[PDB]
Amino acid sequence: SEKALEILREALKELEDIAKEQRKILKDALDELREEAEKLREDDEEEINKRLNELMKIAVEALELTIEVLRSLAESALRALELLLKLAEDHKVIEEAVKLLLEFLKKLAEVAEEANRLALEFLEELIELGGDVEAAAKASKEAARASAEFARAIVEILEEVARLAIEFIEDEKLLARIAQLIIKAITEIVRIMAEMASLNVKAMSEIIKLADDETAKKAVKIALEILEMAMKVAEEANEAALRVLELAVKAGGDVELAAEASHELAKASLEVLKIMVEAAELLARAAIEVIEDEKLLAEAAQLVIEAIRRLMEIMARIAKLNAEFLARVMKLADEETAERVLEIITEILRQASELAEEANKAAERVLDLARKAGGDEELVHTASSLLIKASAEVLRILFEAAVHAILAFNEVLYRLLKEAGADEEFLKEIEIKLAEIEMKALVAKNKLESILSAIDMKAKRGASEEELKELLRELKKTVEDMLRELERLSEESRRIAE
Amino acid sequence: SEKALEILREALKELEDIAKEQRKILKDALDELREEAEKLREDDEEEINKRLNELMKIAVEALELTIEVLRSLAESALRALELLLKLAEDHKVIEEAVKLLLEFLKKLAEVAEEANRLALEFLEELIELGGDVEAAAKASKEAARASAEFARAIVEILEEVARLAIEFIEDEKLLARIAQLIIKAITEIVRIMAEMASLNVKAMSEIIKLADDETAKKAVKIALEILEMAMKVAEEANEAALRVLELAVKAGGDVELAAEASHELAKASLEVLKIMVEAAELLARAAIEVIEDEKLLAEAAQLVIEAIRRLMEIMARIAKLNAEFLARVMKLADEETAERVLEIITEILRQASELAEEANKAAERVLDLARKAGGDEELVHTASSLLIKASAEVLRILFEAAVHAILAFNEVLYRLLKEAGADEEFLKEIEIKLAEIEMKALVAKNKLESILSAIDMKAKRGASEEELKELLRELKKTVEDMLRELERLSEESRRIAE
Amino acid sequence: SEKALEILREALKELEDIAKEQRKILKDALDELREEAEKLREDDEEEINKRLNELMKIAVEALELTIEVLRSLAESALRALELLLKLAEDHKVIEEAVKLLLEFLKKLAEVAEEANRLALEFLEELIELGGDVEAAAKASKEAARASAEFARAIVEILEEVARLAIEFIEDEKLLARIAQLIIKAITEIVRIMAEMASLNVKAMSEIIKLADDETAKKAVKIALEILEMAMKVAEEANEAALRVLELAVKAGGDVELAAEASHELAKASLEVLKIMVEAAELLARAAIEVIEDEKLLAEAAQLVIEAIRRLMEIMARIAKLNAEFLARVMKLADEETAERVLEIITEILRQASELAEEANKAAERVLDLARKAGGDEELVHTASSLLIKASAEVLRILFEAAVHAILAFNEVLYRLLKEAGADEEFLKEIEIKLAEIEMKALVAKNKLESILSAIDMKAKRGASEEELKELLRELKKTVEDMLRELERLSEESRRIAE
Amino acid sequence: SEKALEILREALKELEDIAKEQRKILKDALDELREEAEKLREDDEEEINKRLNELMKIAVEALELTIEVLRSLAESALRALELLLKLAEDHKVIEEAVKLLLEFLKKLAEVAEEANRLALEFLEELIELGGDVEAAAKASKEAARASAEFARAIVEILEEVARLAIEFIEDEKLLARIAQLIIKAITEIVRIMAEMASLNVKAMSEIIKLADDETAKKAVKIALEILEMAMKVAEEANEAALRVLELAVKAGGDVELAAEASHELAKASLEVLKIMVEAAELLARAAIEVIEDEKLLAEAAQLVIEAIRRLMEIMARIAKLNAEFLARVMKLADEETAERVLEIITEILRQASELAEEANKAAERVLDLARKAGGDEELVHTASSLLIKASAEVLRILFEAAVHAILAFNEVLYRLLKEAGADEEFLKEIEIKLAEIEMKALVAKNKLESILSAIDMKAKRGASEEELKELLRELKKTVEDMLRELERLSEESRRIAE
C-alpha cells in the first residue's frame, strides 16, 4: 500500500527533476542564441534584419520543443498514477497519490510558465537589438499558442486523473474530496495560462513602442488574438472541470460539496476573465498612446472592443453553464441543500453581473481614451453600440440563468413534497402554482427580450450613448423587478406548501 | 381543472399584451426613423441617395427584429399550452385551452400583419422622399420574406399544438373537433400571409410609378418573387394541415368530419391562390402601364406569365393532394360516408377547375394588356403557348385526381361487399368489374395524355392561339366525356352489386 | 378466369389503337412541319439556315414526345397484366395473358420503329431543302437516343412481366415456357432496336454526301456514337434476358429448356451484333468515298475501326456471359442434359468465333478501302494493330469460356458419380483426374496468354500485318490444339469413370 | 496422397517452363528492337532523338507485359496449390507441396529479375546509341516500378500460401516449419527485389556519365525514387512476413521457432536495407564525380542524404516492429524461452544499431565527398544536421524497443510466478517491483527524449558538427547506461523472486 505511494513519489520527484533540467537546457540554449545575436550586432542592415528574424524563429522553435518535452513528462506522470491506482486497492494511498500528482502537474505548468517567460524576455532582448516588429509579434504569438496547447494538454490529463479516481473509487466522502481537488488544480492551471497570456500581452505592449503605424496595428491585432486563445483555454478548462464534477455527481459524490466546487470554479474563472480584461485594457492604452493616427487608432480601439465583447460573452456563458450544472445537482439534492444551492447560484450570478459591469467600465475607459486621442468617430460610435448590445446580452443570459435556478428550486420543492407522501389535491395545487411560476417566468423572459429588442433597435438606428445608458438602466430595473417578483411568487408558493 | 385553464388564459393575455406593446415599440422606432429622414430631406444628392437606403435597411432590420420577438412569443405560448396539457387530464379544459391558444396565435399573426403594413407604409413614405427604387424594392422583399418566415413558424406551432392534442386525447368526438379547429386556424394564418403578400405587391405596384425602365423591371421581378414565396407558404400550410388531418384519422378521429375539414382547407387555400392571381394581375397591369418599352414590356409580361403558370400548377397540386387524402380516408370510411366523400371530392375538383380557368382568364387579360401596349411578339407568343401548356397540365392532373377518387370509391364498395359476407362467385364478378373500371381508367388516362401530347406538339411548333383554344376545348370535351363514361360504368358496377 | 383474359384483351386492343392513333398524330404534325419548311423554301440564306435547324429541333422534340407516349402505353399495359395476374389463380389464363402482352409490346416497339423511321425520313426531306448537316446529324442522334431509351424501357417491362409470371406461377412445364417466350420477346425488341439504329446509320450515310470534310467527319463520329448506344442496348437486353432465365432456373424452371432459351438468345444477339457490323461497314464505305482527304479520311476510318473493336468485344462478352450461365445451369442439371449443355455451349462459342472472324473481315475490308482511297499510313497501321489485338482478345475470351464449360461438365460428372453412391477410393481417383483437368487447363490458359503477349509485343513494336496474321494463325492453331487435348483428357477421365 | 503431389509437381514444372519461354520471348523481342535501333543509327538528329525514346518506351512496355505474364503464372501456381490442399488430408504431402511451391515462386522471381536485367542492359545499349538521358532514366524507373509491383504480388501470394497452410493444418511441429519456410521465401523475394533495385541504381550511375548538369540531377532524383520504392517493398515484405508469423502463433505454432523466424527475417531485411544504403552511396559518388557544379552538386548530395535518412528510419521501424512481435510472443511463451526471446531481441537491436551506425558512416562519406568536390555549404550543413537528427531518432526508437522487451520479460516472469501458485504477499512484492521497473523505464525514456531535445535545439540553431558528434556520443553513453541500469534492476527483481 504505502510502498506504492512511495514508488510513485520517487517517480514524480525524478520527473520534477527532469523538468527542471529541461528548463535549464532551454535557458542555456536561449543564452547561446542571445550571445550569437549580440555578437552579430557589432558585425549590414539586411544581415541583421534577416538573422534576427531567423533567430527569433529558432528560439520559438526551442520553446515549442521544451513545451513538447514538458507535455510528455505530464503524460508519463499520468501513466505512473495509472500504474499506482492498479497497484492499490486502498483509498488512503489512492487519495494521497492523486494529491501528489496534482501537485506535480501544478509544478510542471509552473515550469512551462517559466519557459514562456524566458522566451518572451528573450524576444524583448532581441527587440532591443533591432529585429522586426511584425516577426517578433508573430513569434510571440506562436509562443503563446504552444503554451495554450500545453495548458489544454494538462487540463485533459487532469480530467483523466479525475476519471481514474472515479473509476477506482467506491466512496462519496473521499470521491467528492477528489472532485474538489481536481477542480482546484484546473483553476490553478487556467490561472497560470491566463498569467502567461497577460505577460505576453504586456510584452506586445512594450513592443509597439517602436513600430510603424501599420506594424503597431498588426501587433495589437495578434495580441488580441493571443487573448482570444487564452479565453478559449479558460472556456475549455471550465468545460472539462464541469465534466469532472458531473461524473462524480453521477457516481454519488456528495451533492453540496460538488456545488461548492462548481461555485469556486466559477469564481476562479471569473477572476481569470477579469485579468484578461485588464490585460486587454492595458494593451489598448498602450496602442492608443503609440498608434498615432486618426483611422488606425480607432481601428485598434474597435478591435480591443471586439475582444472585450468576447470576454463579456464568455463570462456570461461560463456563468450560465455553472448555474445550469448547479440546477441539475439541485434537482438531485435534498430539502435544504437545494436552498443552499439556490443561494450559491444567486451568489455566482451576482458575481458574474459585477464582473460584466467591470468589463463595461473597462470598455468605456478604452473608448474614452480613444476619444481623447482623437480617433475616428464612426468607429467609436459602433464600438459604443456594440458594448450596449453586449451588456444587454449579458443581462439577458444571466437573467435566464437566475430564472432557471428558480424553476429548478421550485421543482425540487415539488419533488420533496411528492416524496414525503403529501395529499393528491394538495400536490395538484402545488403543481399548478409551479405552473404559475413557469408561466410568469416565460412572460418575464419574453418581456426582457422585447425591451432588449427596443434597445437594439435604437442602437442600430444610431442613438446617443447617454440615451442608451438610460435605456439600459431601465432594462436593468425591469429585470431586477421581475426577478424579485418571481422570487416572491415562488416563496409564496413554498409558504402555501408548508 | 378549470384553474389551469384560467392560468393559461392569464399567461396568454399577458403575451397578447406584450405583443401589442412590441407593435407599439416598432411604430415608435419607425416614427423616429421617418422623422430623421424628413429632417434630412431639408438638410446633397449623394447624402440623401445614401442615407435613405441606409434608413430603409435599418427599418427592415427593425421589422425583422419585431418578427423575431413575435415568433418567440408564439413559441412561449406553445410552451404554456404544453404545461397546461400536462396539468390536465380532463377533456373539456384541454379543448378550451386549444381553442384559446388558436385564438391567440390568430391575434399574433394579426399583429405581425400590422407590423408588416407599417414597414411597407414607411417604405412608401420614404419613396415619397426620393430614395432608391431598387433598394426600396429589395427592402420590401426582405420584409415580405421575414413575414413569410413568421407565417411558417406559426404553421409549425399550430401543427405542434395539433400533435399535443392528439397525444393527450382519448376520444373521437372531440379529437375531430380539434382537428377541424386547427385546420381553420391554419387557413386563417395562410389567409393573413397571402394578405401581407398582396399588400406588398400593391406597394411595389405603387413604387414602379417613378422608376427607370430597368428599375421598374427589377421591381416587378422581385414582386413576383415575393408572390412565389407567399405561394410557397400556402403550399407548406396545406402540407402541414394535411399532416394534421392524417394524424387524427390515424388516431381514430371521425371520418366524415375530417373529410369536411380537408374540403374546407382546400376551399380556403384555393381562395388564397385566387387572391395571389389577383395581386399578380394588378402588378402586371401597373408594370405594362409604366414600363414604357417594347422589349422590357414583354419581358415583365412574360415574367408575370411564369408567376401565373406557377400559381396554376400549385392550385392543381393542392387539389390533387387533398383529393388523394380524401381518397385514403374514403378507403377507411364506410358504406355511405364514402359516397359523401366522393361527392365532396367532385366538389373540390370542380372548384379547382373553376379557379384554374379563372387563372387562365387572368393570364389572357395580362397578355391582351401586353398586346395593346405594344410589346415584343415572340415573347407574347411564348407566353400564350406556356398558358396553353399549363392549362392542359391542370386538366391532366385534375382528371387524374377524379379518376383516383372513382377508383377509391369502387374499392370501398368492394371492401364493403367483402366485409358484409357476400358470395365468392359474386365477389369475383364484382372484382372483375372493378378491374374493368381500372382498365378503362388507365386507357382514358393515356388517351388524355396522347391528346395533350398533340396539343403540346402543335404549340411548340408555334400554332395560332385561336387554334390551340379550339384544340383545348376538344381536349376538355374528351376528358369530361371520359369521366362521365367512367362514372357511368362504376355506377353500373354498383347496380350489378346491389 | 377466361373473362379476365377477355378484359385484358380488350384493354390491350384499346392500347394498340391509341398507339396507332399516336403514330398518326406524329405523322400529321411532321407533315405540317414539312409543309411549313417547303413554304419557307420559296420565301434569305440566314432565314433558311436558321429556321431549318429550328424545325429539325422541334421535329425531334415531337419524336421524343411520341416515344414518351408509347412508353407510357407500355407501362399501362404492364399494369393491366398486373391486374389480370392478381385476378387469376389459373395457369392457362395467366400464360395466355403473358403471350398476349408480349405480342402487344412487340406491336408497340414496331410502332416506335415506324415513328423513328418517319422522323429520319423527314430529316432527309429536310436535307433536301438545304438545312445544316451537323445539326441534322445531331437531331438524328437525339432521335436514335430516344429510340434506344424506349427500347430499354420495353426491356425492363419485359423483365417485370417475367418476374410477375415467376412470382404468380407454381409449375415448371409452364414456367419454362414463359421463360422462353419472354426471351423471344427480348430478342425481338433488340432486333427492332438494331434495325432502327441501322436505318439511322444509313440515313447519316446518305447525309454525308453533301457535307464539308469536317462536317462529314462529325456526321461519321456521331453515327458511330449511335451505333455504340445501340450496342449498349443489345448488351443490356442480353443482361436482362439472362437475369430472367436465371430467375426461372432458380424457381425450378426446366433446365434443358432454359439452356435452349439461352442458346437462342445468344444466337439472336450475335445476329444483331453482325447487322451492326454491317451498318458500320456501310457507313465507313460512304465516308471513305465522300470524305475526300488524306488525314480526315484515315481519322474516320480509324474511328470506324474503334467501333468495330467495340463490336468484337461485345460479341465476345455476350458469348462468355451466356456460356457462363449455361455452365451454372449445367452445374444444376443432370447426367445427360449436362452433355447436351456442353454441346450447346460448343455451338455458341463456334458461332461467336465465326462472327468475330466476320467482324475481322469487315474491318479488313474497311482498311483496304482506306488504303485504296489514299489515307494516312500511321493511322491505318494503328488500326490494323488494334484489330490484331482485338482478334487476339476474342480468341482469349472464347477459349476461356470453352475451358470453363469443360470444367463445369467435369464437375457435373463428378457430382453425378458422388450422388450415385460410388466408392470412396474411386471418387478420389475421379477428383484427382479432375484436378488434372484443371491444372492442365490453367496451364493452357496461361500459355495462350503468353503467346498473346508475344503477338501484342510485336504489334506495339510495329510489325508487318502479314507477319501478325501468320502469328495469329499460329495462336489459333495452338488454342484449338489445346482445347482438343483438354477435351480428350476430360473424355479419358469420363471413360476411367465409366 | 502422393499422386496429388506429383500432379502439382507436373503443373509447376510446366509453369516454370512457360516462364522460361516467356523470358526467351522477351529476349527475342528486345533483340529485334535493338536491331531496329542499330539499323536506324546509320540511317537525322531529330529522327534519332525521337525514335530512340519511342523505342525505349515500347521496350519498357514489353518488360511491363512480361511482368504481367509472370504474375499471372504466380497466381495460377497459387491456384494449383489451392487445388492440391483441398485434394489432400495428409500433412506430409501438404508440406511437400508448400515447399515445392515456394521453390517455384523463387524461380519465378528469379526469371523476373533476369527480365529486368535484360531491360536495363538494353537501355544501356540504347544510351550507347545516343538516346535521351531523362527519357532513359524515366523508362528505367518505370521498369523498376513494374518489378517492385511484381515483388509485391509475389509477397501477397506467399502470404496467401501461408494462410492456406495455416487453415488446412492441425499441428504445431509442422505448422511452425511452414511458417519459417514461408519467411525464408519472403526474405528471398525481398533480396531479389533489392538486387533488382541496386542493379537499376548502378545503371543510372552509369547513365549520368553523359548527361547535362540538370539531366544528371534528374537522373539522380529518380534513382533515389526507385530506391525509395524498393524500400517500400522491403517494408511491405516485412509487414506481410510478420502477419504470417502472427497467424501461426495465433494457431499454436511453436513459440521459440517463430521467434527464430522473426529474428532471421529481421536479419535478412537489415541486410537488404544495408545493400540499399550501399547502392545509394555509389549513386552519390557517381553524381558528385559527374554533376560538376557548386549548387546542383549539393542538391544531389542533399537528396541522397534524404534517401539515407529514410533508410535509417526504415531500419529503425523494422527493428522496432520485430522487437514488438517478439515481445508479444514472449508474453505468450514460457519460463525459459522467454529469456531466449529477450536475448534474441537484444541481438536484433544490437544488429539494428550497428547497421544504423553503418548508415551514418555512409552518409558521412557522402558528405565528405561533397565537401571535397566543392558544393554549397548551407546544403551540406543542413544534411549534417539532418543526419544528427536521424541518428538521434534511431537511438530513441531502438532504446524504446529494448525497454519494451525488458518490460515484456518482466511481465512474463510475473505471469509465470502467478501461474506457479506463489503467495499473495509475495506476488504483490513482485508486482510492485515490476511497477518500479516501469516507473524508472518511463523516466529513462523521457530523459532520453530531453537530451535528444537539447541536441535538436543545438542542431537547428546551427551548431558545429564536431560539437554535435560529441553531444551524440554523450546521449549514446546515457542511453546505454540507462539500459544497463534497467536490466540490472530487472535482474535484481528476478533474484528477489527466486
Numbering used by the authors:
A (entry chain B), B (entry chain C), C (entry chain D), D (entry chain A): 1 to 43, 46 to 500
The publication says:
Here we describe extendable linear, curved and angled protein building blocks, as well as inter-block interactions, that conform to specified geometric standards; assemblies designed using these blocks inherit their extendability and regular interaction surfaces, enabling them to be expanded or contracted by varying the number of modules, and reinforced with secondary struts. Restricting helical geometry to ideal straight helices with zero helical twist in principle considerably limits what types of structure could be built, but this is more than compensated by the great simplification of downstream material design, as illustrated below. Using X-ray crystallography and electron microscopy, we validate nanomaterial designs ranging from simple polygonal and circular oligomers that can be concentrically nested, up to large polyhedral nanocages and unbounded straight ‘train track’ assemblies with reconfigurable sizes and geometries that can be readily blueprinted.
To construct expandable cyclic assemblies, the linear THRs must be placed such that the propagation axis is normal to the cyclic symmetry axis. For cyclic designs with this property (those built from turn modules or heterodimers; see Supplementary Discussion), adding or removing repeats simply changes the length of the oligomer edge without affecting the interface between monomers. We tested this expandability with a C4 ‘square’ (sC4) oligomer for which we had obtained a cryo-EM reconstruction with 1.6-Å-backbone RMSD. To expand this structure, we inserted two additional repeat units (six helices) into the linear THR portion of the subunit.
